[PDB]
Design a protein around this ligand. Structure first.
Ligand SMILES: Cc1cc2nc3c(=O)[nH]c(=O)nc-3n(C[C@H](O)[C@H](O)[C@H](O)COP(=O)(O)OP(=O)(O)OC[C@H]3O[C@@H](n4cnc5c(N)ncnc54)[C@H](O)[C@@H]3O)c2cc1C
Ligand SMILES: Cc1cc2nc3c(=O)[nH]c(=O)nc-3n(C[C@H](O)[C@H](O)[C@H](O)COP(=O)(O)OP(=O)(O)OC[C@H]3O[C@@H](n4cnc5c(N)ncnc54)[C@H](O)[C@@H]3O)c2cc1C
Ligand SMILES: NC(=O)c1ccc[n+]([C@@H]2O[C@H](COP(=O)([O-])OP(=O)(O)OC[C@H]3O[C@@H](n4cnc5c(N)ncnc54)[C@H](OP(=O)(O)O)[C@@H]3O)[C@@H](O)[C@H]2O)c1
Ligand SMILES: NC(=O)c1ccc[n+]([C@@H]2O[C@H](COP(=O)([O-])OP(=O)(O)OC[C@H]3O[C@@H](n4cnc5c(N)ncnc54)[C@H](OP(=O)(O)O)[C@@H]3O)[C@@H](O)[C@H]2O)c1
Lengths: 303, 303
C-alpha cells in the first residue's frame, strides 16, 4: 500500500522523504516527536555546508518545511515493531498498523547512560543529557560535563553562557573532539578540565545534586567535588528496538547495511545515525538518506 | 608538507575542506575556476535539505564562505597530474607543484558531447551545454533540448522563461528524470516533446544554427526541423585526466573507491561526481566529502 514508509524525521529521514516524494512514491514519514531529531537538541551548527551558523531547531524547521508541499504524508507514530511478509511489510505503532512496499529506517541514536549511583535519582534536578534543553536551569552554577568527544566539548562551550564555570571530565589525557572545538575549549576561560578521570557517584540531598565522586584512571586517586549540574555525553546507543528480532543488527544493536543503505531484508533500508558506522554527522545523514530514497525507488519499480 | 590537498571546489571539495580544516589539518583547496563547480551552472536548486529553493550560484557562495575563516588555503590551480611517492604525493599544476601527505580528488564531471556534424561548428552561436549560462541569448526563439534525464528536463523548464517554445528530444518514450520534474514538464504549455528520436545533424548558415536533422529510433524516419538553439544534456563524463595512469579509474575513466572514499593508492581519496557511482547529487557530494575528510585525518594521523 505505501510505496515507502520512513521511520524517523531527523535529517536522514527528512532527506529520504523529500527524495521519495520527488520520485512521486506514496510516502509516509512517521515521527514520535518533533521533526529534526538530534538537531533539535543542538545549539549552534557550524559545519552544515550551505550555512555559516544556524541554530539546530531552525535547521530542523527549514528541513521539515517543504515536505507537506511535496506530498509527503507526515504522521505522528511511535514504532514498536516491523514484520517482513515477503512482498510487503507491516509497521506497528502504539495504535496503528501500516502496510508498505519498502521501509527506510532513520531512527538515530540515544545518549548512553553512565549507570552510576545518583544518575537516575537526580534525573530531574541536576543530571541532564541535553544542554540546550536544560542549560538555563544552571545559571551561575558550577557545571560538570562528562565525556571527551564532539558533544561533550561543544555542549560544554555552549554551557559557559550559563554556568559560573564548566568542567569537562574525560577518562583520558587527549580529547576525541574535532581539534577546532578542542582549541576553543582550551582557550575559553570559563572551561576547566579534569583529565584521566571517570565519575563514580553522583551525590546530593533530597532535592538536588551537590557533588560528584570520581576516580583517576591512572592512579585510582578518588576525589569528591561540589557541582550544581552534571551533563553526560559519553557516547551513543542505537535506537532500533523495533527490529531486534529481524536479524539486521550487530551485537551492539546498530543496523548493518551495505553501501547502498540495504539491510539483509530486501526493501528494508537504514540511514543515518542508527546504522553501524563511525562518522555521525548531519552531512552523512543527509547523504545516506538521499541514497536510501534512490534505492527504494529502484526496489519498488522492480517489485 | 600539506596534510591534505583537495582538488576541486564544488560541494564535495568544499565540504571536505571545511571538515579537514576543522580537524586543523594544513589544508590546500585548488580550484581551476569559480568555487561551486556544477552548482554555478544550475538555476534553481530545490532538493538541498535546509533550503526551500536557492539559486545555484548563491548556494556556491554560501558553501565557499566559511572556508577562509577556517584557515583553508584557497588557491587557483589547474591540476595536470599527480605522482605517488609512497609517503608523500606530488601535485602538478600548470605552473606549480605541491607536496602533501594525502589527496582528496573532487573534480566532478563534464557534459558529454553528441559528436554530430554542426556540433563544434555552432559552438558559439546556437549550440550550448549550459542553460543558465546561455539562455538569455535565445529569448523568443524555438529552443531544442537534447536528453531525457534530470538535467535535460529541468534545464528545459528553466529555458521556457526565454524561448517561444522549448522542445525536449529523447531517444526513448519514457524520461529518466525525477517524476516530479517529468510532471512539471508534461503540464508546462511551453514545453513540447520529440520522443524516440536522436539528433543526426545540426545545420545552419555561416553565422548560426538554423535546423536539426533527427531520426526516430523505432522506425528510422528522418525529420528536419527549424530551431534557434540546441542545449545538449546527454549525460556525463568524469573529469579525471590527471590520474589516467595511476590505475584508479574504471574503463570509462571514473575513479573507483570503496565506501570510505579510498582508491587503491593509500592517502588518495575521491569524492562526489568524479567517482564511479550511480547517483550524482549535491547531498551525496556533501556526504562523500565529509567521509573523505574524516578518513584523510585518520590516514594522516596514522602516517
Ligand atoms: C549535542 C549534539 C550536537 C551535534 N552537533 C552536530 C553538528 O554541529 N554538526 C553535525 O553535522 N552533526 C551534529 N550532531 C550529530 C547529528 O545531530 C546527527 O548525526 C544527526 O541528527 C543524525 O540524524 P538522523 O536522522 O540519523 O537521526 P536523528 O536526528 O537522531 O533523528 C531520529 C528521529 O527518529 C525518531 N524516532 C526514534 N525512534 C522512533 C520510533 N520508534 N518511532 C518513530 N520515530 C522515532 C526520533 O524522535 C528522531 O526525531 C550533534 C549531535 C548532538 C547530540
Ligand atoms: C544543470 C544541472 C542542474 C543540477 N541540479 C541539481 C540539483 O538541483 N540538486 C542536486 O542535488 N544536484 C544537482 N546537480 C548535480 C550536482 O550539481 C552535482 O552532483 C555536484 O555539483 C557534484 O559536486 P562535486 O563537487 O563532485 O563536482 P563539481 O560541482 O562538478 O565540481 C568539480 C570542481 O572541480 C574543478 N576542477 C575540475 N578539474 C580540475 C582541475 N584539473 N584542477 C582544478 N580544479 C578542477 C571544476 O572547476 C569544479 O569547480 C545538477 C547538475 C547540472 C548540470
Ligand atoms: N560538530 C559535529 O559534527 C558533531 C557534534 C556533536 C556530535 N557529533 C558526532 O556524534 C557522534 C557522537 O558524539 P559523542 O561526542 O556524543 O560521542 P563519542 O564520539 O562516542 O564520544 C564520547 C566521549 O566520552 C568518552 N567517555 C566514554 N565514557 C566515559 C566516561 N565514563 N567518563 C569520561 N569520558 C567518557 C569517550 O572516551 P574515549 O574517547 O576514551 O572513547 C569519548 O571521548 C560522533 O560521531 C560525533 O562526531 C558531531
Ligand atoms: N535535481 C537533481 O537532483 C539533479 C539535477 C540535474 C542532474 N542531476 C544528476 O546529475 C546526473 C547527470 O544528469 P544528466 O540528466 O545530465 O545525465 P543522465 O542522467 O545520464 O541522462 C542523460 C539523458 O540523455 C539521454 N540520452 C543520451 N544520449 C542521447 C541522445 N543521443 N539523444 C537523446 N537523448 C539521449 C539518456 O537516455 P537514456 O535515459 O536512454 O539513457 C538520458 O535520458 C544524474 O545522476 C542526475 O540525477 C540531478
Amino acid at each position: 500500500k505505501y510505496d515507502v514508509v520512513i521511520i524517523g524525521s531527523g535529517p536522514a529521514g527528512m532527506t529520504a522523504a523529500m527524495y521519495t516524494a520527488r520520485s512521486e512514491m506514496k510516502t509516509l514519514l512517521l515521527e514520535r516527536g518533533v521533526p529534526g531529531g538530534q538537531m533539535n537538541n543542538t545549539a549552534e551548527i557550524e559545519n552544515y555546508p550551505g550555512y555559516e551558523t544556524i541554530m539546530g531547531p531552525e535547521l530542523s524547521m527549514k528541513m521539515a518545511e517543504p515536505l507537506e508541499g511535496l506530498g509527503v504524508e507526515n504522521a505522528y507514530g511511535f514504532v514498536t515493531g516491523i514484520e517482513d511478509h515477503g512482498d510487503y511489510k507491516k509497521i506497528i505503532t502504539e495504535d496503528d498498523e501500516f502496510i508498505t512496499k519498502s521501509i527506510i529506517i532513520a531512527t538515530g541514536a540515544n545518549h548512553r547512560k553512565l549507570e552510576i549511583p545518583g544518575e537516575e535519582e537526580y534525573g530531574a534536578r541536576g543530571v541532564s543529557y541535553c544542554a540546550v534543553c536544560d542549560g538555563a536551569f544552571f545559571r551561575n552554577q558550577e557545571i560538570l560535563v562528562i565525556g571527551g568527544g564532539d558533544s561533550a566539548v561543544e555542549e560544554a562551550l555552549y554551557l559557559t553562557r550559563f554556568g559560573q564555570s564548566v568542567t569537562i571530565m574525560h577518562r583520558r589525557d587527549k580529547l576525541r573532539a574535532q581539534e577546532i572545538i578542542q582549541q576553543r575549549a582550551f582557550k575559553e576561560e570559563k572551561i576547566n578540565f579534569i583529565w584521566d578521570s571517570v565519575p563514580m557517584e553522583i551525590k546530593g540531598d533530597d532535592k538536588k545534586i551537590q557533588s560528584v565522586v570520581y576516580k583517576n584512571v591512572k592512579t585510582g586517586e578518588v576525589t569528591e567535588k561540589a557541582f550544581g549540574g552534571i551533563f553526560i555525553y559519553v557516547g551513543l546507543d542505537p535506537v532500533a528496538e523495533f527490529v531486534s528480532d529481524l536479524g539486521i543488527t550487530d551485537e551492539a544493536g546498530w543496523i548493518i547495511t551495505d553501501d547502498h543503505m540495504r539491510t539483509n531484508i530486501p526493501g528494508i533500508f537504514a540511514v543515518g545515525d542508527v546504522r553501524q558506522k563511525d562518522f555521525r554527522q548531519i552531512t552523512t545523514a543527509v547523504g545516506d538518506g538521499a541514497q536510501a530514497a534512490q534505492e527504494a525507488y529502484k526496489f519498488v519499480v522492480e517489485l
